[PDB]
């Protein structure tokens, strides 16, 4: 049970003309957030660094051996390098285009870590999408490659820094009127159900605001006139009645095997799932990117039957439950 | 036809960036074509110490762009429905951090004003250039930003130059893959601009409007070029049982649909000048762009039929430009 703080976290408006990257002698800091999550999860390994003069971040997913990748993107303001179908690294970060380059720092390690071996199946894979983070802040620094390579370089197996760290930083949600946008921050959490795990990671910087199981709206749109946080579509319906009168980047990781087409229609399943705790999502605003990445280490077995069903034990079935993760992981992010 | 330009065999455990003070170059090629497009500018770069670099295609003041991509090799960052620059480079996934040198420094033009509508946005595409050297040299940030700083209005440097550095074509078998080059080509119709920008790394070949195949695919034993589908049928005979990136800069208005399917439709039209395209092997991106400055008429008729003035048509003329584009970066 989520313990999500009622207090607001206004992110308040920016102050313009703040300066950018070499205005200052930026030096990497890692994120440790508000609490580490431990997970087990051999493979995986997080990163998370971010420039104080930001503040802003971002956090890189490494998985040294490669891994098989579905890329869901929604909305009109995806801002993704890569996409690839097979990545050693995910890097999520701030900075909306610009912070892309992290990920570009993330290869250029990489690269050096093979000891600048090119062949095309020694390829280091990473695929990156970004938020637009700076009216949460004044200035106009970025991830840069420095800092992406600073996260690859942080990365702790089995360990995630919750709230304001990497890419979580400045990300905010709520977003029909600034005034109301709060921070958010970045979120994961991990499931393991006998030999399968799943592992959410989570950087919402929606339009929309984060909801919880009970329907109740708990980050964002919080308006201090009235000390509350309402859905948005009450602030749309009545702004339709006045005016018209007669991005979030996620990925989910599992061990369990899973084809392509399964790989790309869990995605679907689990990207879609997020408009639970995530509402509006997906909308032309939104730049929101889901990577589905399976490690490919157990198989389903090849019947889907149970006691708790003849079709209980399938992808649909493991969406279902990734769902269920990653919704855990946006009410961390909101916490 | 042409004399063979063979690629040879890479030699591996070649040097990287960390080796080198790497010094950009401005990329003048083999040869500069100059054409009237304002608001367009090019600027290339190249390392060589690799060799290889970036061609940074500039439009300052944004222009809507369709992305058509195909093939399972791509290596694109953006990929955005509006664009300030394309950077075109080498160096496969690593070269896409050139496009991050240029968003960098457009980001200082802008004097790190990051309104929405501000952003300044950079779609990169990349090609594997490693076989086709001795170092692990790759277009990097100090590259792209090189790229965008030596962009001029109305220049292209054809050939060995930018991402064309080395560029190489018709890889059914290493020993007979040639080195391609970058490639532009520019027609004016009365009010109407197109430009087109290419850089092919293709597995196939390039072949001209006889069907004659003139880069790609030489064979030095007996000092002809084959179409790859020759070589295909024989080797499956036998044992069964025994990418391009590119881009067309118009100025003709185009709704998002139309530019979408024009995108799409000179994309497949380089089937005709590059063979086999679009396959598996190749992360072939074609970037569509409109500066929106030029309508077509409301009604499609003139003289020459009555559906003769439309987007289908212009898709059709700007397929010719981008065929002698693929051309040039083969001469
Ligand atoms: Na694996
Ligand atoms: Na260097």
Not at 63 to 84: F, K, N, Q
Not at 170 to 180: E, Q
Not at 264 to 275: I, L
Not at 313 to 334: C, K, P, R
Request: glycine share 12%.
């Amino acid at each position: 049970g989520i313990a999500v703080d009622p207090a607001p976290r206004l992110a308040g408006p920016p102050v313009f003309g703040g300066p950018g990257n070499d205005a200052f002698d930026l030096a990497p800091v890692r994120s440790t957030g508000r609490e580490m999550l431990r997970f087990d999860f051999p493979g995986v390994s997080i990163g998370a660094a971010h420039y104080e003069e930001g503040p802003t971040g971002a956090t890189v997913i490494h998985i040294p051996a490669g891994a098989r990748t579905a890329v869901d993107a929604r909305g009109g303001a995806v801002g993704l390098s890569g996409g690839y179908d097979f990545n050693h690294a995910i890097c999520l970060a701030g900075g909306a285009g610009y912070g892309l380059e992290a990920g570009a720092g993330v290869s250029g390690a990489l690269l050096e870590r093979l000891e600048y071996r090119t062949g095309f199946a020694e390829l280091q894979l990473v695929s990156s999408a970004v938020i637009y983070d700076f009216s949460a802040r004044s200035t106009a620094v970025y991830p840069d490659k420095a800092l992406g390579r600073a996260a690859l370089e942080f990365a702790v197996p089995g360990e995630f820094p919750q709230g304001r760290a990497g890419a979580g930083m400045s990300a905010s949600a709520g977003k029909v009127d600034w005034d109301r946008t709060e921070i958010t921050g970045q979120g994961a959490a991990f499931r393991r159900l006998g030999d399968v795990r799943i592992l959410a990671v989570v950087v919402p910087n929606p339009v929309g605001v984060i909801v919880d199981r009970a329907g109740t709206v708990v980050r964002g749109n919080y308006d201090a006139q009235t000390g509350v946080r309402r859905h948005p579509v009450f602030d749309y319906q009545e702004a339709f009645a006045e005016q018209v009168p007669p991005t979030t980047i996620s990925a989910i990781v599992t061990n369990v095997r899973m084809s392509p087409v399964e790989l790309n229609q869990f995605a679907k399943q689990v990207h879609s799932s997020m408009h639970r705790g995530i509402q509006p999502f997906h909308t032309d605003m939104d730049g929101d990117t889901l990577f589905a990445v399976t490690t490919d280490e157990i198989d389903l077995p090849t019947t889907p039957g149970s006691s708790r069903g003849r079709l209980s034990v399938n992808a649909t079935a493991l969406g279902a439950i990734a769902s269920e993760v990653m919704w855990d992981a946006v009410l961390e992010a909101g916490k």
